[PDB]
């Protein structure tokens with residue numbers, strides 16, 4: 001098949017004409033730092049975790065034992081591979097097993113208004129046969145058509161094994177990919193564009209293979 005599409009790889013979102021402020025209060029929780037030097041704190045019941053807020057630097061009661069700073073510490077899995085996914089161009093798969101709920105990778109790109117993006121669609125993206133636009137917040141999107149990271153190659157499934165979650169990370173919304181279920185080695189990562197992706201209003205046949213496939217992506 002064809003070569004993978006070109007993009008400018010970035011390590012952090014680029015803010016173009018909007019900045020995705022979360023409006024969250026300063027983060028606080030009631031977690032206690034485990035006396036064991038090597039046990040994690042801020043686990044499932046962390047009051048910050050429960051509102052999709054990451055703990056902030058210097059103020060978490062667990063200190064360096066806090067495990068609720070995954071996005072801000074860029075704690076991405078290191079076992080991802082870009083590969084030819086049959087009938088779906090390029091996709092991303094994991095080379096190691098993943099566990100339900102686990103953080104995988106941040107989705108990066110240019111953060112733009114829906115106005116700027118609809119402008120880019122008419123002027124720059126009208127010829128494209130692959131689309132790269134994630135929803136973020138009211139009126140803003142993450143455009144990875146030109147800059148981003150390898151999460152831009154993750155394909156859609158009507159029966160997805162991953163999902164996007166929107167988190168407040170030190171006052172700004174960021175989007176991460178998280179596993180919905182345990183997945184064995186070699187599994188292609190997928191998420192449901194109907195739930196997470198901007199409606200580019202293009203009809204493309206879905207090849208996810210699900211018994212109850214929606215027929216087209218986002219349908």
Ligand SMILES: C[S@@+](CC[C@H](N)C(=O)[O-])C[C@H]1O[C@@H](n2cnc3c(N)ncnc32)[C@H](O)[C@@H]1O
Nearest residue numbers: 088089090130131152153154155156206207208
């Ligand atoms: C975010 S890109 C994913 C990477 C893309 N496959 C590539 O080769 O660059 C989304 C594009 O991938 C293709 N795609 C994603 N999921 C698909 C699916 N389930 N069935 C067919 N094509 C899919 C569509 O062309 C879609 O516009």
Ligand SMILES: NCc1ccc2c(-c3cccc(C(N)=S)c3)cn(CCO)c2c1
Nearest residue numbers: 131132133193194197198199217218219
């Ligand atoms: N229902 C909401 C919704 C969500 C996403 C889409 C898409 C779509 C297709 C390919 C790529 C992308 C990306 N943003 S990457 C989005 C098309 N449509 C209309 C046709 O169904 C959608 C509708």
Ligand SMILES: [Zn+2]
Nearest residue numbers: 029031042046
């Ligand atoms: Zn906590």
Ligand SMILES: [Zn+2]
Nearest residue numbers: 042055060066
């Ligand atoms: Zn914490």
Ligand SMILES: [Zn+2]
Nearest residue numbers: 158206208213
């Ligand atoms: Zn499908």
